[PDB]
Amino acid sequence: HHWGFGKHNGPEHWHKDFPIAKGERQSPVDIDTHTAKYDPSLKPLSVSYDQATSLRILNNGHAFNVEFDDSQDKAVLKGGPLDGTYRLIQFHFHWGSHDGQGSEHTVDKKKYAAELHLVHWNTKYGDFGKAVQQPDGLAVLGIFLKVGSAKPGLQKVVDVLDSIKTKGKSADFTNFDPRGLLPESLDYWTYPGSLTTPPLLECVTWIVLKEPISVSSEQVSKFRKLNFNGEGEPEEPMVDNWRPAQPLKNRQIKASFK
Numbered sequence: 001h002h003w004g005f006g007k008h009n010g011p012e013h014w015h016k017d018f019p020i021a022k023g024e025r026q027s028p029v030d031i032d033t034h035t036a037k038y039d040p041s042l043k044p045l046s047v048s049y050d051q052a053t054s055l056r057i058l059n060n061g062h063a064f065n066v067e068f069d070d071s072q073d074k075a076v077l078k079g080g081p082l083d084g085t086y087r088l089i090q091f092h093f094h095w096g097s098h099d100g101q102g103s104e105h106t107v108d109k110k111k112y113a114a115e116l117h118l119v120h121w122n123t124k125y126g127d128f129g130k131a132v133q134q135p136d137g138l139a140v141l142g143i144f145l146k147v148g149s150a151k152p153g154l155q156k157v158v159d160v161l162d163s164i165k166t167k168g169k170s171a172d173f174t175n176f177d178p179r180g181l182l183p184e185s186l187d188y189w190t191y192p193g194s195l196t197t198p199p200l201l202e203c204v205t206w207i208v209l210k211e212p213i214s215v216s217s218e219q220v221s222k223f224r225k226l227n228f229n230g231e232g233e234p235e236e237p238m239v240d241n242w243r244p245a246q247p248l249k250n251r252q253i254k255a256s257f258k
Ligand SMILES: [Cl-]
Pocket: 158, 218, 219, 222
């Protein structure tokens, strides 16, 4: 595809192939903590990843995805703002060219070093491809990464990246437990939004955790050693694969806390 993260095909250009890029429910957004409103209707998140079955990790040319067997009916996100049950299909990250940027969501304009997205689809639509065509099709759990102590549960991910350095490379990645990527608190903000890469479909209930996970400088530096390009082609480090905050328009960000 033509789209990427370059000066001539990056986020500012996506609207030409995907006009929904200038839509009413685009993601990510800045979360203004002044105005985000606490909503007591909001239930605790239920994240059930004990039966989550990871399969493989793939460099797709703009990030790396860890893919799951989404036939596992117990590997589910539910509760919080959601009706029904959502199955984990993949996770990936967004990160920067340095520690001071990389997240897609911001909090009072603050950018984090990276952001993790755990992507789930609504079982009522049968599969992912059908779910993304519906406003309540996906639930994406977003988790900020900041630099400090190391996150032990991330280490298997960062250590495998050397073997998937270029576009198209993959590695077996079984027995990875995504519970090791979760912070202590499941306090969250939620709002209706979109995929943050093309096709940018407005099909996502976003659930963004308030508490970042801490990862070490070295862990996040390994992300930046990946390449956008395929093998044999001219080296281009995979960095700044984040879409900037988009207009909130007529949406309300709700907080599950305070
Ligand atoms: Cl490391």
